[PDB]
């Protein structure tokens, strides 16, 4: 399914679920708070 937190997601490709913000520094998933 989708990713969660601290997962390797690509920014612009929406690899993580619709509840996190993919970072562009090391391509990791994290909360948007």
Curated annotation (Swiss-Prot):
Family affiliation: Belongs to the neurotoxin 10 (Hwtx-1) family. 15 (Hntx-3) subfamily.
Domain notes: The presence of a 'disulfide through disulfide knot' structurally defines this protein as a knottin.
Miscellaneous section: Negative results: has no activity on Nav1.4, Nav1.5, Nav1.8 and Nav1.9 sodium and calcium currents.
Coiled coil: none
Residues that bear Leucine amide: 33
Subunit and interaction comment: Monomer.
The protein's role, per its UniProt record: Selective antagonist of neuronal tetrodotoxin (TTX)-sensitive voltage-gated sodium channels (IC(50)=1270 nM on Nav1.1/SCN1A, 270 nM on Nav1.2/SCN2A, 491 nM on Nav1.3/SCN3A and 232 nM on Nav1.7/SCN9A). This toxin suppress Nav1.7 current amplitude without significantly altering the activation, inactivation, and repriming kinetics. Short extreme depolarizations partially activate the toxin-bound channel, indicating voltage-dependent inhibition of this toxin. This toxin increases the deactivation of the Nav1.7 current after extreme depolarizations.
Tissues/organs with expression: Expressed by the venom gland.
Species name: Cyriopagopus hainanus
Protein name: Hainantoxin-III 1
Cysteine disulfide links: 2-17, 9-22, 16-29
Location of the protein in the cell: Secreted
